[model samples]
Target: TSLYITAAPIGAVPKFLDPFEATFIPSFLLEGFFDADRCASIAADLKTDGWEVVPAGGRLLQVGHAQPIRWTRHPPRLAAPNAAHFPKPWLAALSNKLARRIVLQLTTYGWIVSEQGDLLWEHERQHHYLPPALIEAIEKESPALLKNMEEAGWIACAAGYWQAGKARSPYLPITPEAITEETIRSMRAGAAVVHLHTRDLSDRRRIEIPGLGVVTVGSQRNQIVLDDYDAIVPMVKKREPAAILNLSTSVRGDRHGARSKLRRAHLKFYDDVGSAPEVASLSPAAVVFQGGGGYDNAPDFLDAQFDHFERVGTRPEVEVFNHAIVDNATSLYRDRLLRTGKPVLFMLVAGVDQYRRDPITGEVEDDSLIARVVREEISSLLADESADSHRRAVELAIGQLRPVVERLRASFPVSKISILLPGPMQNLLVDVALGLGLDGIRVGLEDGLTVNDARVPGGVRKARGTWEQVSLVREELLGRGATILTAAQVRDMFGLGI
Candidate 1:
C-alpha cells in the first residue's frame, strides 16, 4: 500500500533510496498512480491507527481526529489543513505545508527571501534579514498608545546646520548672533530644543582655510573656527530663554590646540557661566561616522564629565548608536554615573553607514568603480524591479531597530525613545517611527537637507527648507494623536527642574 505521511524528522541515510518503506514523499505523490487495493489498504491502515477519512467528494479526503485532513491520490490532491497542530509554535502559525513547501521549493530553485519582507531583490543593508516574528511582536505589543491619552506633547529639536561646511548658505544660521536669530525663528516655528555646535563670532575676524574637511573662517566668516561654547551658551539662552540649548562637547577639529581639554572646557563653561544646561548630550564610546565621530570616553574622562553634570544639575541626553552604546549607558546608570529617574532621553541613531552622498553639497559618493559593478551584478540576477527600494530600506532599518528599542524600554525604562536617522531618510522613517509607537522625532537640516532630497546635490526638490521639514513631522505626529511636548515638559519628564 502506498501513502503519504509527514516524514520522520530524523533518519539514517533515508534519502539513499527514492522509494522505500514509509518514505515521506510529497502529499501530491499520493495523487499519482496507485492501485485501488493500495488505496483501500491505506485507508484501513490509517483507520487502525485512530484516524478517520471522510470522503470529501470528488477525490478529496479528510483525515485526523478533528478539522485536519489527509492527502488524497487524485486530481484534488491538497495540503493538510489545520496547520495549528504543527510541532513548534512558529511552524504552527504558518498557513500550511502546501504554502510552506512552495517557499522551500522556490528557495531550492535559487530564489532568495528578503528579510525586510521585500519580495524584490535589493541590498538595503548588509545581508539584510530580520526575523518576521520579531517584527510581528513589535507591531502587536507596540505600546497601547492612547488615542486621546494625555500626552506631554511632541518636542521638536532643531539641529542647526551652521556647524557643517561653510556658513555660506543664505538660509543657514552662520554666526552665533545669526544662530540666535535662527533659534528664535525656529522656536517660533515649533522648535523646543536647539542642539548646536558653536563657533566664535565675537569680533568678526576671518580665517578661511581647509581646516577639518570644511572651510573655516576668521572674524566674520572663518577667521578662526572656534568651539566657543562659553560664548554661544549664554548667547542662545539670553535670546531664546525657553529653548533647551544642547551644546556639542566633542572637539574633533578645533582651530585651537588641546582638543581633549577643550571638549571638557565646553561642558565646564556651561557650569562656569551658571548656565548649567537643562540637557547635555551623553554620547556613546567607540562611535565613528564619516564627518562626525566619537572617541572612547575613558573612565577618567567620563567620571569627570558625568560628575560635572551631577554637580551642575544637568541631565544627560543619552545618544545610543548601537547596542554596545546602550550597554555603556546602562552600566553608567547602575554605577551612579547616570542618575536613574524619569527615563533618560534615548536617541536611536540609525543609517550612519547608509548614506551615499554629502549633506550640504549635491555630490554622489556611491557610484564608485567597485560599488557600481557589484550593484549591477546583484540587480541583473536578484533585484526586484517593481519594488519601492526606499520604503523597503526604511522598513528593514526599523525592523533591525525593534529589539534595540524594546531592550531600552525593558531594561532602562526610559521616558522617551527618539529616532536619529543621520542620513536622508527622514520622511519615510517618520511614518515608521510613530507607527512603532516611538515618542518623538528630532529632525533638522542636520539629519536631512530637504524632504524630497534624492540623496545627492541639486534638484528643484533640494533645499525645500528645514522649517517645512519640521512641520511635516509635527503634523504627522499630531495626526497620530501625539502632543508636542514643550521644552519645560521635556525637562520635567527627564526629572530636571522646569
Candidate 2:
C-alpha cells in the first residue's frame, strides 16, 4: 500500500505565508503534491488500509491526524520507517518550480530579478541587472526612457518675470513694493519658483512701437538694478521663505557688444551683498528681436556666465529657442562645465518670430526698423473688437506654436523640459501643453497680458495679475491628478541640497 506523510510534524500546525516570504523557507511546499498519479494511488491505498483518505490539494494540516495531540514537557521524537515514500529528488524539483513561478509572477508586475537573486522594482533598480558595457550602450543610444522613468510624476511650475509688463500689460507689478506683493500672491497660488528681472525705473524710455504708437517702457534702456533686487528679495522671503529665486541676467540694448561685463557685475553684486539667487537664466543662443534690435551671447560670454554660476552655487535655467541651442547646453554638460548629479533645467521658448529663419533666403533676417512694424501689428490685432478676429488670432497663434512645441518635445527629454509661451494666447497654449503631458510650464505677466476667457466679449480678457495665472495652473494640475511640487521639493528633485 502507498503511504502518505505530513509536510510538518503532527503537533506543529502550518500557517499561511506570502509567496515571496514563503520562498525563504527551504523545505516549504505548495498545497498540492507534484505528481497527480502518485497522489491518486496513495489516496486509494490509504482508504483500503482502513485509514481516512485526505482530499488531494488540501491544506498541509488536513493531510494528517484529525485530532490535535498534546505533548508532555519533553522533546518529541519523529518516527522514520520507510525511505521509499519520501523522494528527495521529487521534493527538490517541486521546490525549484515553486521558486520559478514566484519569480515569473513578480516580473509580471514590473519587478526585476537581480543577478544576486534579489527582487527590485524596475524604476528603483539603477544598473542592478544591466552589465556595465550594456548600460553605456543604452545610455548612448536611448537614455530618455531611463531618465524619464526616474523623474516621472514630478511637475515644476515657474512664475515668469513682469519686466515686459510695461510694454504688454496695462497693469502689472513693476515697482519693488508691488513686485513683492505679487510674489507673495504667486507663492500662495502654488508657484514654487519665481523668475525675477530687475528694472531701472529711472531709465524708462519713450519708444514708438508701430501698432501701439509711442509708449513709455521700463527696463528698455537699463534692465538690471541691484538695489531693486536687494529690496525685493527680503520682502518676498518674509512672506514666502521657501520660494526659489531665479534672476535674469539678460542685457538689453547691447546687441553687438560683449555683455559679459554687465552680466558679471550683476553676479558680483549679489556676491558682495552676501545673498544670491538660487537660479539664474542663461540664453544659450543669440536672439534677434522682430522689431529691429537683438541680444548676443558669444561662446566666451557663455563660458564666463557658467564660471560665475558655478562660483555662486547657482543653477542655470538653460533657455533654448531651437535645436541648436539644446546642442549648446549638451556640449556644456559633456565638457563638465555644468554641474553634475543635478537635473538640467531647460526652458523651451515659443511664439518668438525672430528665432525663425527667412524661408527663401535660408538666413536670419534682422531689420532695425521692423521692431516698430511688429509692435504695430500686435497693437492692431489687439485693437480688433470682432469675436471672429479674436478667434482667428487664437487659431493662428496656436498653429504657429504647435510645430515648434512638437519639435522641442521630440528632441528634448520630456521630464526636464518646460514650455514658455509668451503671447495673448498664453492660457490657451498652457491648456495644450497640459494635454501633452509636459513636466513643467511658465506663467506670468511677462508672457501675456490677456488670456482666453470664454465669458469675455471677444473671447479674451486682461489677466487680473500674475497671481491669477498661477492659480489657474494650480487648479488645472490638481484636476489632472498631477502633483504640484513645492520649492523645497523642487530643490530636492534637482539635487540642490535643500
Candidate 3:
C-alpha cells in the first residue's frame, strides 16, 4: 500500500477505502482532484469506513464552498501487523507539492484567493487591487495616456514677418516670391493661420514714410506697405484657399496721425483685395520697444482700428503684451467696441523686454537691464553640470509665464489664447505653453530666427525658415498627442464663415 501511494502523483488521493487495514486498497483512485464536491464525497466515504477526516484550512465562504480535507503528515497507524503507515516527512513533502497546484487550480477555475482569505474573479482583480484614483493620476501625469481622452487640437499660426523690413536672417522671406513660397510651404506643413506683413517691394533699400520720415527699408522701423499685399495675398490664396490670412496692423512710433494712416491703409487694402484676410492683428495697448521707441495704440486709436476691422469684416487677433493690454482688451469688449458673437483670439507675447515693464515708471524696462538679468540668470542656472539644470531652466521659464497666462485667463475667460515667444528661448516657452494646454502657437521667422540657440559669437547657427518652424511645431504637437487644426477648423472655431 505504501508503494502504491508513493507511486501515485503528489496531490492525488484514493477514491475508496476497504474495511480491513491490510485490505484497504482501491480499484480506482482520484488523481490531482481537490474541488469541494469531490472532497466532500471522499470524506464521507472515509467516515463510513471508520476513518476520521478533519478540515485543515478554513472555508472559502466568498466562493460559496468549504475548504477541502487536508491529509496529515503521516498515514494512520494500525494495531495489526503488516499495516502500512506513510512517513511523516514524505507526506509533508506531498503537502508542499500541492501548495502551488492548489493556486493553479483556483486560477484555472476563474478565482483568485488572496492571502487574507478573500476570493476574486480574474476580471475584477484590477479593480479589487488598484484604486480608481491611482489610475486617474497615472493618466493625468502621462501625455501618452491622454490619447485615451478626446482628441486635443491646436491652431498653428505661421508668422511670416515681424515688420516689413526687419530681417533677422537672410533666410527670412522678404520678396513676394520668397514670401509666397514660404507661406504655401507653411500651410502644407499644417499652419492654419498665416500672419503676413506686406513689404515695400518697390525699393528694398530705403523708403520715405509719410509720418515716420525716410527709413531704410531693411531697418526695424521700416514702414509696412500695401504694394505686395495684392500680389502676395492672391498668390497664397491661389494655392491655399482655406488659409486664414492674418495681416499685421502693427506700426512703430507714438504719432497718432502717422500710425492711424498706416493702420487704415492695411484695412483699406484688405477691403480692396480679391482675397481679403480673415484675420488682422490689433494691439489693444501701447508697447515700448527695447530700442527706445514704441508702438502707440491709444484708446481712441484702438477703437478706430476695431471700427475698421468690423467694417472690413476681418476678425481681430488681439495682441496682449501685458496686464494693461489685457485690461484694455477687456474694456474694449465691455464697451461693445470689439466684435461680438465670435470667440476673441488673444496672443500672449513673451521673451522680449518690450512686454516686461518697470513697476514704478510704468514703462518698459531698459534693454540693458533686461538683457543683463536674463543673461546672468541663465548663466547661473546653466553653471550647474548636474542633470537637473535643464529641469530648473524649464521651471524658471514656466514660472514666469504661468502668471501672465493665469491673468489673461482670468481677464478673458471666453477667449482663445495663443503664445508668441520670440528670440533664442522661444521653443523653451513654447514647450511650456504646450504643456500648460494653451489653445494656439505662433511660429516662423517673424517671431524667431532660431530655436533655443543664443546669438553669442560661437552660439549662432543656421537660422530656421518659416516652413521649418511650422514643421517643428507640428512635430511637437504630434509628439504630445495633439492634433494640428486645419484652416477650416480654425475658421469654425473663430466663427468665421468661408
Candidate 4:
C-alpha cells in the first residue's frame, strides 16, 4: 500500500516514500545480463566518468553534474535534492549490458529509487514521459530471481504452547485439558510429533502439586511449570495412543541445579520419573524467552541438562537457532553424551524474534540473528506485493539452513529433523519442507497463530485449522509421488517404542 500510495504522488504520509529498499527496484531499471567481471568492471568505470562513489562498496554512483529532475527517495536516509542525472546515451557510455548491470548493482545500494524521475515509477504512471526508444531498449523480468539451488530435507516440529499467550489468546490452551486436546488435534492434522511447553495451573493459595507427588513447588502468578505433564502425557497417549510427544522442560526455574530447586522448577522435570516424555527439548542456545523474561543457558547449565536427559531416557530434540550454535550440538555428540546410532531430532527453528518482547520493558528488541538476515531478504523481495513473498522467504531461510542441515544430517543419523515456524508462513514453510523430502513437519497454535483469527490472537479452536495446513503438505507430497506418513508409521520411522 505504501508503494502504491507513494507512486500515486498523493498521500498524507509522503515521507513513507523513503522506504524504497534495494530489493523493491523493478527489473526493467537494469539491462539484462549476468556477467560479474564485466559488471564489476563497469562499476569501476563509473568513477572515471566523474560520478561520485558513495560509501559501502561503491554500489551507488552519484552524477557529479547533478541536475535536479523531480524527486528522489533513499532508504532510511533522507531523499536527495533533485531528479537523478544519468549518463546519457548510457548504452554507449557503458555498453548496454554493462550499463544495465551497473545500474542493477547501484539499485542494490538504493541509487535509482533516490531519483525523482526514475524510469520504473514513471512507467507505472502511464505517461509518455520516457522516450519510446529507451522503453523499447529495456526489458523487465520478474522481481525474484532463481539461483537453481536444490533444497534438502528438514524436520518440522509443532510447538504446542510455552505459556506464550495472554488469557485472551484462544490458540494458546491455558489448561492441561486444553493443551491435551490441541496436541491430539495437531497429530491428526499431520504433525508426526508435538513440542510441548506445559504450564501448571495454580490456585496460588494452595501449594500442593499433583504429577511428581511434590508439595513445595514455588508459585509465581499463573507461572509456567510442568506439574501437569504427568496428567497431560497420559491423556494425550490415550486419545492419540501412538502420538509422538516431545515434552517442554525449558520452564526457566531458578539457576541452581534441579536437586536444590524443586524438580518442577526447571528442565529437571524431564528427569523426573513421574512424567517421562519420549522426547524432550534441550536448548543449548545462548538466550531464551519464557513469558517475555529472558535468561542465559550457560555451558554449565547445558551440561547439567544433557546429564539429566541422558539419565532420564528422554531423547533431547537438540535445537539450533542459527549457524553459530551448530557447534554446541557438535560438542555434545563428540563427548558421547547422546546415544550413537540412535535417530536424534534437531529442531531448525526460525522467526522467533516476534516472541522476543522484553517482559519488563514491553519493548520488542530482539531481532534474532537468524530472523534479521531472513527479513533483510524479505525486504528485498517486496514481501507485501504477493503471497509468493512467503515462498521466497522460506527459500531464503532454507538456504541459510542448508549447510547447517547438511552438517547435522552428516553428524548422526537424524532419526527425524524438523523445522518449527510461526504464523503467516506456516503452510508454505511446511509445504516446502515436505516438498523437499523432509521426514516430517510440525504445526499448532503455539508455533503458528495465522491460521486462527489474526485479530483474536493465539488459541486454536479446533484441529480443523491445522488440518487445512497439513492438506497443503499432502498436496505437495502427492505431486512429488510421496505418501503421507501415518502416526504409527512416523513413530516407527523415528525409532520410538511407545
For each candidate, give its TM-score against the true structure.
0.51, 0.53, 0.56, 0.51
Model 4 agreement with the true structure over 333-422: per-residue lDDT tens digits = 544434622677766666554234455997654435345656566555643435687667667766655666677766665445666565
Native-to-model Cα distance after best TM-score fit, residue 117 in candidate 3, in Å:
64
Predicted structure 4: lDDT: 0.42
Q: How accurate is candidate 1 locally (lDDT)?
A: 0.42
Model 2 CA lDDT for position 465: 63
Question: For model 3, what is the error of residue 35's alpha carbon versus the real structure, in angstroms, after optimal superposition?
Answer: 99
Which digits, one per residue and each the tens of the lDDT, describe model 2 over residues 329-437?
5655434333522455666665555553554996865322113344345435645646665555455544544554565444444225566665543544445455444
The numbered model that scores best in TM-score is 3
For model 1, residues 112-132, the per-residue Cα lDDT tens digits are 333332112121111111122
- Candidate 1, 434: how far from true, in Å? 0.9
**In candidate 3, what are the lDDT values of residues 69-151, reduced to their tens digit?**
21134221111222211122222222222322322222222333333333224331110011123224434444342232112
